Symmetry: C3
Amino acid sequence: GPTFQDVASQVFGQPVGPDNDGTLYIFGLTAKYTEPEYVDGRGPYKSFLKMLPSIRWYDPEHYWTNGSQTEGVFKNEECVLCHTVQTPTIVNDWKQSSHGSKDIRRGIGIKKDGKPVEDLVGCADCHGNNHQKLEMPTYKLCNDCHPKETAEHRAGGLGSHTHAYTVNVLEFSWHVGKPAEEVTGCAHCHAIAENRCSGCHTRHKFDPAEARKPTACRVCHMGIDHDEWAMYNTSIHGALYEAESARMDWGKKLKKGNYRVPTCAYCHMQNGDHNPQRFGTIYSDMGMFQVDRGAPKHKAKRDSWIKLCQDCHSPRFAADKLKEMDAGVNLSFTKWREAAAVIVGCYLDGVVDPMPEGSAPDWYGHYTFSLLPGGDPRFYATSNLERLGLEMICYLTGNVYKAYAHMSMYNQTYGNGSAFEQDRKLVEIKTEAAKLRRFAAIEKKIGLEHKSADFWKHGEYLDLLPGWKRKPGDVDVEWFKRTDIPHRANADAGVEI
Amino acid sequence: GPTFQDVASQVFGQPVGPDNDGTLYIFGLTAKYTEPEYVDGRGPYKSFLKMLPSIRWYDPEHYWTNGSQTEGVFKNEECVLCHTVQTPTIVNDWKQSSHGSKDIRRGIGIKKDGKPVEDLVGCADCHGNNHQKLEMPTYKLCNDCHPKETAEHRAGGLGSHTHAYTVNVLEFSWHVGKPAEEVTGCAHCHAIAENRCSGCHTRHKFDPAEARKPTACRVCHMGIDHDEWAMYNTSIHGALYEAESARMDWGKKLKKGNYRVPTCAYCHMQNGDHNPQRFGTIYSDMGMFQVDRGAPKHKAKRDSWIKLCQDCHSPRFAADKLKEMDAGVNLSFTKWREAAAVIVGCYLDGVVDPMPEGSAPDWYGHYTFSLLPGGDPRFYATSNLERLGLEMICYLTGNVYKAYAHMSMYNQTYGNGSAFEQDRKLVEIKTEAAKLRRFAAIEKKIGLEHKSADFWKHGEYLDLLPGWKRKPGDVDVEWFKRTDIPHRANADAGVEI
Amino acid sequence: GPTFQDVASQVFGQPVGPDNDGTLYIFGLTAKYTEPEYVDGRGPYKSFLKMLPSIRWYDPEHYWTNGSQTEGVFKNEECVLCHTVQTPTIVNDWKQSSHGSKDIRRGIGIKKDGKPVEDLVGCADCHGNNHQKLEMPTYKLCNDCHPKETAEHRAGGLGSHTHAYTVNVLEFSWHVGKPAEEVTGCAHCHAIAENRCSGCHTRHKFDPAEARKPTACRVCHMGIDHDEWAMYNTSIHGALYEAESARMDWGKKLKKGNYRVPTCAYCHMQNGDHNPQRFGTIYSDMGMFQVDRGAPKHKAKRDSWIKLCQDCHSPRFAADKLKEMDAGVNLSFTKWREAAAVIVGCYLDGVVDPMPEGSAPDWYGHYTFSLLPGGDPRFYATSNLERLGLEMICYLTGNVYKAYAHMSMYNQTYGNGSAFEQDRKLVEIKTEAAKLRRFAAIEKKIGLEHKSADFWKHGEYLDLLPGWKRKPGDVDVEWFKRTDIPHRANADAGVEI
Ligand code: HEC
Ligand code: HEC
Ligand code: HEC
Ligand code: HEC
Ligand code: HEC
Ligand code: HEC
Ligand code: HEC
Ligand code: HEC
Ligand code: HEC
Ligand code: HEC
Ligand code: HEC
Ligand code: HEC
């Protein structure tokens, strides 16, 4: 047959053409997908992983090249004079930073190669002197003068800023399983957290006072799968932050007695610690793994949290609130286990439409049920039942923990990522399960041989997925053998981990 | 058969265990639900209602006990010196309050037992002197020195702060029908509103200027069933609040001419009135009950609102806006009545899956259709059709009123709790109704005897519901006989009301 | 049969009555819809289009009449003295404006009829002197003294403020297809943008500093079909705006070097240009039409945007970010084209329930499939399949463009209006398609003659739609013949356009 584009073209009277030629396609009906220019992605799936070339800014050690048209070797004060015209805000930021202004320096005692840094730290000191060999830095630059903050930034485990990109982008199913341009933001968000020092105190002011605000975290720590910004913002702490932000002193260091209202940085970067993951009781895959943080074996962590709350509360009150979290989280997993039983039950009875063999292969190249061991739990290229299952465990159950951890009365109960949203999801899942069972029971009785539709398996998007290209020997298992970084438990890792 | 936990345990290789032992359960699959320690709940369902012990902070008259390890009888200045170390922000707050600072006092003329309060009001004056008999106060303390504000705080009817917990937690189906730990936030949110004086001007600063901001209300007045924060925030008033908050004078009293931008407190706590419910035309169960507030019988209320708007507008303009609300609300109920007709029609024809007898009993212990008289309208432990019905009347139709009342052009039409969301919900409900009817018509013709799945009735969560435990003589009807408080019209009340 | 109201009345014991009599109807069950008082709407559908009378404030040239009870001809200083009592904030605003205060004037050189305006511009100068002939102005007043800003405000094409109401309310299907009171906010939002000069710098302060903030745009530029506020707010620009709003100098003019953080006005009202649409590459029906803005034919626009970003960035970085937008948008249309193929496929096979003839006629008066040429793509009064289709193209695919254009890493990928939301919608659409196909295949095999339910066609709301009233010769085609305004491509336009 002819393409969907060809039919639509003859109906709307617009010719079929490539999507990238500048034509304004009516509802994008007659445009054909073209493959963007890619560069090869890194990690264990490097044989087929792709990035857009703009990865140069975020993993510059491996991708950065000269792309400037301006030639010359310059001195710091020449960088400033020309960029005052060419990129004025970069200079205005830098002039308002300690790097570019001695007047706002605090005599911290910054050293490079054992010697005190008493001059201005200018454009050339961070980027180089030669305009045809300009450098785009990572934390490795900052380490030259700020080793303490850098060592802590690099001290986290899996699930922290430290391995956000190197492990949790390059090894992650939802990233490696999709066309590169669909998930550019994933690479960049996670890479900004890992490879940069500007995620909280932005360039070029590098102002710690900015870093202390919730705005230093919420661009990443938000949304459907980890809604801690909204949980915080809908707690009484969050409301007080909004009430007091304009007039409170953000210049004070994060320490006991310096703040009325706690922020993300206050509780998680306690006393300026740049390894914010370490105060957490235990890594729980964003609350998808169940754990009672109030159990005897986690007493030192619970006591540490109680003492943190004791900056501004009774410890009895804090201990009660954290016990409410434990109880609320444990109740929330009963609804997930119900949902799981219903979903896997449909699979075992063979009533799921489509069954795994009726869909496009998963990112491993397998036709495996997503909510079984070895499968890829997901929201795309799968059945409605499986999608609703992923949404139950990831979007809702994990966020119930976040709602309790951040004292959002509403989002624990009624709101986004709450108990009542779990209820409603559970009804959806049972509804989908009942539909599937009634169709199968009818089709059996009348002897109708049901075959799942082709649109579950093929389509313009589904045909782009890398699951189709997967073959034996396409995994770089040496990557997974590495012990200097942790790893995800991928089904095709091929080694221990 | 063996449990879901037992199967999952043998598949993932993690042993089955209690949820509360500290083990990190893989997707919470092999964890068993344990019942948290409870204390008995109050109200008409006290025979089985439970609370977590942390209810001590929110209903302290009935639950507060000594839990301190520090001994001694102290004087105010000793409270301050030690707490300066132990809970520094409480002291910093108190020092910045009128209670703890004579310099910021306004000479209001506060009296206790007829005599002027000219000293500092310290920790011991509110909490007691003996550290083993410390008191956790309610409005009953505040009444000693602030009788006007307390009398107004206690002057509201059902649906106000005055009875938020005593009636609308202890008598409410969605609270009494669920395990206590699932709805801790409900008890606390509603109890903070009723029993405390810190919901708007927080402890320990007790700053009225903080209370005047929308942040004093939005932690409670938000979300899917009452989205007035979002309605306000997406009106031009809300945008102007965000624009002017940082530089406007919040120190001015709530009165005509003192503010450009109106806030929740400005319109609802008119002239500092602590009974904000009373300016409302009529209680309407969060807009779930239809009423034309522009009808001749509500003229005094409509005129009062028009005059409130006239602080900053033409009364003709205000009268027009409030007429738009009346018209928009009346249009919105046509979609609800359509939806109701479709839903109850499915019930009358017996095509709802599950039918009420196929689900777990409701919180009364009955197998009754949720959208009939005597039933419990809900979003959980019920059919998809009934869930979608509850969402239509409560989440959407009630919020259309809120969108119009707060001048949110977008949320009246496109947005959350809008006309267009009602449309989309109505399509969902008709869709569910059509599916149910087509399955029933097929099953009838081929003689398939459909029985609703067991997962509608039993499951790890569904088995915890109190509907199973309900028996004759388990209601404290003496509670419902009380005339000093209003009551909800519960089906098992047993008395008049 | 008797009405739904009559049945409910006999069950709840509340009498049937009109919705507008002031009665508090229990769940609005026994209330009857009454038609509000209307005035005739303007435009090509004037034969049946209606507005509420409050349209007087928003299209005053055609609807404004005297409605004051105060008589007299007054001088400016008499307006102020009385309104200081009657509408105090209007006077307080005006006193704080350049119109009412010479001290804050900047010597701009404002002229009327060629002569300098050196006096105060008072109430009477904008509204008239006679209190029984008071005027409610449009931009036509402002033009007297501010011709530059007015000429630019009137310079936009279709899709801009310039024709928001005159074309995109009066000619739009979703407005003309619904009862007037349901879409009052649509008329007003779009009319405020077109006919007023107070949408960004509100009356009566008319402060440009207020206009520069994102709060000057977000009340309109938000939500499910155009979520640029949320896209901006969840970018690092948005977080920095929230961090710096309170202490930054909003008094500075929108120009290169005056701001660290860019706002809507900064990027779209470049250098104070009051035709913000013109910087856009090409109008794309809110991103529903596909276009590669990085193609050679759009180089001048892409270069202009790169140079705008170069106020604060490298142009290489800006060029890369805008290329990511192009790639991300082009990937997003593959999912829409899949969805479209599935949806129209169901129509061609005749398995859509209801089919177009089973629903109420569309707003043209036709029984036409909404996602075919000549149809009306919509979310209401249509099938679930068609609703989900509209949601795919309008709410999601169009917002992917908005997410990329505003650098929201999260909303490009996980969040509202993202790639992953498209995925989940695509699964919903395929799910609905599979249900429809399985019902049709079963019904065919057993010889069951399915007729779509009556609730798809009739109901209390559906019966109000103007599709029922449409007849030949009810379109004012002379309107569509006009060349001084652009037009929408409506199926019943009757002329070229
Ligand atoms: C040495 C050559 C430097 C390099 C390389 C970087 N920084 Fe720096 N930094 C340097 C000095 C001498 C100081 C001032 C110390 C003082 O006495 O005040 C700073 C300070 C900062 C700060 C704090 C700024 C503030 O206003 O308080 C930050 C947040 C900071 N520096 C960040 C930082 C980053 C992220 C770097 C890598 C990109 C980096 N600096 C490198 C000297 C040097
Ligand atoms: C102190 C009052 C808090 C504030 C303010 C914020 N968070 Fe928090 N968070 C807090 C606790 C007590 C916990 C649970 C830790 C435990 O082990 O008991 C959390 C947890 C999180 C997490 C998950 C960490 C993990 O699972 O180990 C994240 C990602 C997180 N918090 C984010 C976060 C952000 C971005 C904040 C500002 C919006 C924020 N938190 C503030 C307590 C406190
Ligand atoms: C958020 C998660 C951050 C990231 C990532 C990094 N920094 Fe940071 N920094 C952050 C905060 C909230 C503050 C204030 C902490 C406080 O105690 O109040 C800081 C501060 C700094 C400083 C100033 C240190 C001083 O002695 O005053 C420096 C020099 C600094 N940060 C360095 C730095 C570098 C090199 C980082 C990456 C390599 C980096 N920070 C990341 C928050 C966050
Ligand atoms: C920034 C805007 C984000 C985007 C875009 C996505 N991710 Fe993310 N992710 C982000 C945060 C702040 C969190 C931590 C939440 C916490 O409570 O820990 C995460 C976490 C993950 C994980 C862990 C999943 C699990 O094992 O539990 C991974 C593997 C992950 N994120 C990867 C990732 C990818 C590749 C994304 C799109 C393909 C995705 N994230 C989007 C922040 C952001
Ligand atoms: C008497 C022994 C007191 C009791 C008990 C409580 N308060 Fe009080 N309050 C008291 C004084 C003498 C004043 C100052 C009056 C003056 O001249 O200014 C106050 C003031 C307040 C205020 C206003 C604070 C402000 O800065 O404007 C508030 C909001 C307040 N008080 C609250 C309040 C609450 C909630 C109480 C119970 C918990 C309470 N007070 C008790 C004296 C006394
Ligand atoms: C004045 C300009 C208002 C502002 C600012 C806020 N609200 Fe409001 N609200 C206002 C009106 C005219 C109405 C309808 C009253 C009527 O009888 O006509 C409402 C109503 C509510 C309600 C429901 C009250 C009831 O049904 O009786 C609530 C719960 C409410 N408003 C909450 C609320 C909050 C929290 C506000 C700030 C975010 C807010 N309102 C501001 C007018 C005004
Ligand atoms: C929100 C709903 C509030 C609750 C609950 C209570 N208060 Fe309040 N209070 C509130 C506001 C918005 C303000 C300012 C009002 C104004 O006119 O601008 C106040 C103020 C007070 C004061 C100061 C009174 C004075 O004469 O200046 C007091 C003493 C006070 N409030 C007492 C108080 C107590 C005792 C309450 C509970 C028992 C209480 N308030 C609750 C908002 C709200
Ligand atoms: C604070 C964060 C809340 C949570 C948690 C829940 N409720 Fe609530 N509720 C809250 C407000 C501000 C409103 C008033 C809205 C208005 O327009 O009136 C309500 C209202 C109710 C009602 C009335 C229902 C009806 O009769 O119309 C009740 C009975 C109720 N709320 C109870 C309640 C319970 C027990 C909750 C969880 C089990 C629930 N609420 C959550 C604020 C908050
Ligand atoms: C002439 C009779 C006027 C008419 C009619 C309107 N405006 Fe005006 N405006 C006028 C003067 C003399 C000035 C001050 C010029 C100066 O020297 O400063 C203004 C200024 C404004 C501004 C800027 C205000 C600021 O504080 O910077 C705005 C935003 C403005 N005017 C808006 C405006 C609108 C929307 C009008 C129609 C409703 C309007 N003006 C009419 C004189 C005159
Ligand atoms: C500069 C940094 C931006 C800021 C800040 C805001 N927007 Fe934007 N927007 C920007 C670009 C580069 C684009 C794409 C233009 C192109 O042709 O490449 C957009 C587009 C929009 C649109 C659609 C315009 C069109 O399709 O022609 C709208 C409606 C829009 N932006 C709204 C908007 C608002 C309200 C903003 C503040 C919240 C905002 N933008 C800020 C870049 C920038
Ligand atoms: C938002 C889309 C706006 C609308 C609609 C109109 N104005 Fe505006 N105005 C807007 C901004 C963001 C600013 C500041 C621009 C800057 O360069 O920083 C302004 C400013 C004005 C001014 C002051 C001009 C001066 O010389 O200082 C005037 C006189 C003014 N605007 C007039 C005006 C009128 C007459 C409009 C409608 C007819 C109007 N503006 C609409 C934003 C927006
Ligand atoms: C203000 C609160 C709005 C409401 C209410 C509705 N509309 Fe709107 N609309 C608004 C904006 C800011 C945008 C521009 C988005 C951009 O990226 O261009 C629009 C756009 C439209 C369109 C164009 C549709 C298309 O051809 O692509 C029209 C025809 C339209 N809006 C009409 C309209 C009507 C009549 C509404 C309810 C019936 C509706 N809008 C609500 C802002 C707002």
